[PDB]
Amino acid sequence: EVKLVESGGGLVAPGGSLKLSCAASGFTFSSYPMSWVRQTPEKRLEWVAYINNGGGNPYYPDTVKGRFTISRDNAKNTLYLQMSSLKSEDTAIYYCIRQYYGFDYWGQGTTLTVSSAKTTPPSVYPLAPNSMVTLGCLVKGYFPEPVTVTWNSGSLSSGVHTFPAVLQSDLYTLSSSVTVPSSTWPSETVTCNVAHPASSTKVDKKIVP
Amino acid sequence: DVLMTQTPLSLPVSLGDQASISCRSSQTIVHSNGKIYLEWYLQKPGQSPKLLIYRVSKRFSGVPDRFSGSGSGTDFTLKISRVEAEDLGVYYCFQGSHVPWTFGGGTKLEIKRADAAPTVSIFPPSSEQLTSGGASVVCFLNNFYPKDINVKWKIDGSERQNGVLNSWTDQDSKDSTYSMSSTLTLTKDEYERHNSYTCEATHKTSTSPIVKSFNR
Amino acid sequence: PDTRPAP
Ligand SMILES: *[C@H]1O[C@H](CO)[C@H](O)[C@H](O)[C@H]1NC(C)=O
């Protein structure tokens, strides 16, 4: 199936260190070289590391050379990226990649934020008010990004879109909208599930009329 | 380093029509072995990038026939022959011939569709937030096109501009629309000194605003 | 042959 699952992201002070992990499955891990690519808040893509199938030829751009270290454990089917002397410019989503023809398969990514600020978990507020009804969730006052918002633990996938977070006064706020048939609600329960990994926090808010 | 420069920055296109995305390198990008490692990646809203094309013109497995890459020297091109709504997102070129490997800046592909009016919903503050001392009033303007839209907040019939925060989605791949939310933030003390709250959306689909209100 | 060469 080929699945790559990154982990270890979060908030780090300037000058600090942090190591990312990536769980590889669905293929013969030891046969393929691997790369890390990062995407900055400006949505620019930067390649940051390469390593061959056997764990050799570690290569880096000069922007992270001497600070970043790629490594792998072919027994555990894991790829690592140790970081140190972190700067503001390292803040990004970091993607694990199985490489062959090009960057063939990308993980979903894990987020590093380099900042002196402190972690703040979100407050989550329900939004409640015809054959079709629109409900919502207000996710207010968190730092850093990201949060993931899901509805009924994933069951409600259609009729859902989440608005980009905006920074005001050093905290993020976003909203998520879901639309269901009037029959569906409040006859049956509709719950907003918010995850903030940097604070290791999960909130479940039911939408009551 | 090799600089990869993309053209245009944004590209509007109708369904079934053709799109062309240009890439320009700051130098030749032929590897020591004589081959050119120019790659095309597509990042759809909310997703990781995905490979479409490597070696200038070779489609990665699964990529439909309508994606075609070409070029040499410093000029390279991606063509999409019959754009489908699912093709929207940001396209990146990439050179893998010389180190450091480098990406272009990206070209956003936008789908043109028929003008569509928003579906407006206004929401009052929750009791949970009112206990924290704050009071956000929220308005969703959902599933409209084109992206540009105006929202006006009114408190007891009077316009209110300060404390408003608006946020647009990326284009939806299913229906090719946009949505946006408007959040008016007030203190608890201020919210309870008034009763009538209104958001009205003005869109090019009507000179008449779409008005939604609540009391208390 | 088609794979991107190592750095
Ligand atoms: C491309 O990568 C593969 C995967 O290991 C092999 O190393 C192959 O030798 C490479 N091909 C070229 C042209 O260097």
Q: Going by CA atoms, what residue is nearest to atom 2 of ligand 1? A: C3
Chains with at least 3 CB pairs less than 8 angstroms from chain C = A, B
The span from the CA of B58 to the CA of B63, in Å, is: 10
Query: β-pairing, A10-12 with A110-114?
Result: parallel
DSSP 8-state symbol, B65: T
**Domain B115-214, CATH:** 2.60.40.10
Cα–Cα nearest to B78, from B17, B6, B28, B13: B6
> Domain extents for chain A?
1-116, 117-208
Fold category of B1-113 in CATH:
Immunoglobulin-like (2.60.40)
* CATH topology match: B1-113 vs B115-214: yes
Contact C6 A100 (CB under 8 A): no
The kind and range of the H/E element at B188 are helix B188-192
- Tell me how far the alpha carbon of residue C1 is from its chain's centroid: 7
Contact B55 C2 (CB under 8 A): yes
DSSP 8-state symbol, B132: H
Contact C7 B33 (CB under 8 A): no
Resolution for this PDB entry, in angstroms: 2.2
DSSP 8-state symbol, B127: H
The size of chain A, in residues, is 209
Q: Give C-chain residues touching B59 at CB under 8 angstroms.
A: none
Beta strands in A75-142 (DSSP E): 78-83, 92-99, 103-106, 110-114, 123-127, 132-142
DSSP 8-state symbol, B129: H
Q: Going by CA atoms, what residue is nearest to atom 8 of ligand 1? A: C3
Are A171 and A120 contacting, i.e. CB atoms less than 8 angstroms apart? yes
Contact B142 A177 (CB under 8 A): yes
The span from the CA of A23 to the CA of B184, in Å, is: 42
Please give the distance, rounded to the nearest whole angstrom, from the Cα atom of residue A101 to the centre of ligand 1: 8
CA end-to-end span of chain B: 61
Interface test with C, best of B30, B53, B55 (most C CBs within 10 A): B55
Pocket of ligand 1 (CB under 6 A): A 100; B 33; C 1, 3, 5
**Domain A117-208, CATH:** 2.60.40.10
> Domain extents for chain B?
1-113, 115-214
